[PDB]
Amino acid sequence: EAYVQGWEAVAAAVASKIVGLWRNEKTELLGHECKFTVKPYLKRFQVYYKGRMWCPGWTAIRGEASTRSQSGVAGKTAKDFVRKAFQKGLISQQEANQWLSS
């Protein structure tokens, strides 16, 4: 369901597609080539999962995120990159819907 924040829901769907279509350290957004990667660290008595992704070819923007969840950080890194491109004016609603379709 998507109400009021329709654009925020579309960005979340794009981040989920990035994790489902992510390779060892590379991905593709809207048909363009991009680089998505993850890197967990360790604390005196804890384990954190960090990640960062960007598109070296489509434009000049990046987005990263960190948390305790392993897969959650992947969707979080893709969501931060989509939010930076959405605030500037690159990821549109129709373009994100076409990428999610096929």
Give the residue extent of every domain in the chain: 1-102
- CATH number of the structural domain 1-102: 3.30.160.320
Measured between alpha carbons, how far is 59 from 7 in angstroms, rounded to an integer?
Answer: 20
Over the range 64-90, which residues count as b (16 or more CB within 10 Å of their CB) and which as e?
bbbeeeeeebbbbbbbbbbbbbbeeeb
- Neighbour count for residue 54 (Cβ, 10 Å): 21
**Of 81, 21, 27, whose CA–CA distance to 52 is shortest?**
81
Contact (Cβ atoms closer than 8 angstroms) between residue 84 and residue 58: no
Q: Which method, experimentally, gave rise to this model?
A: NMR
- CA dist 76 to 44, 45, 65, Å? 24, 24, 5
Query: Which amino acid is residue 67, in one-letter code?
Result: T
Contacts of 52 (CB under 8 A, 6+ apart): 36, 37, 39, 62, 63, 64, 77
Q: Three-class SS of residue 44?
A: coil
Structure tokens at 65: 């995120």
C-alpha radius of gyration, the chain, whole number = 14
Task: Give backbone dihedrals phi and psi of 69, rounded to 5 degrees, phi first.
Answer: -65, 145
